[PDB]
Amino acid sequence: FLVLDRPEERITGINDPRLRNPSDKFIYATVKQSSVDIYFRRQVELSTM
Amino acid sequence: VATLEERPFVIVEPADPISGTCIRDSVPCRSQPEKRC
CB B33 within 8 A of CB B14: no
B24 and chain A in contact, CB less than 8 A: yes
Q: Determine phi and psi for A38, rounding to 5 degrees.
A: -65, -40
User: Measured on CA atoms in the order A22, A28, A31, A35, is the torsion positive or negative?
Assistant: negative
What technique solved it? cryo-EM
| Share of chain A residues as helix, strand and coil, in percent rounded to the nearest 5 | 25, 0, 75
Residues in B touching A45 (Cβ below 8 Å) = 25
Helix (H, G, I), strand (E, B) or coil at A17: helix
Q: Which of A40, A37, A20, A47 is nearest to B24 (CA)?
A: A47
Tell me the nearest-neighbour CA distance from B26 into chain A, angstroms. Answer: 11
Resolution in A: 3.7
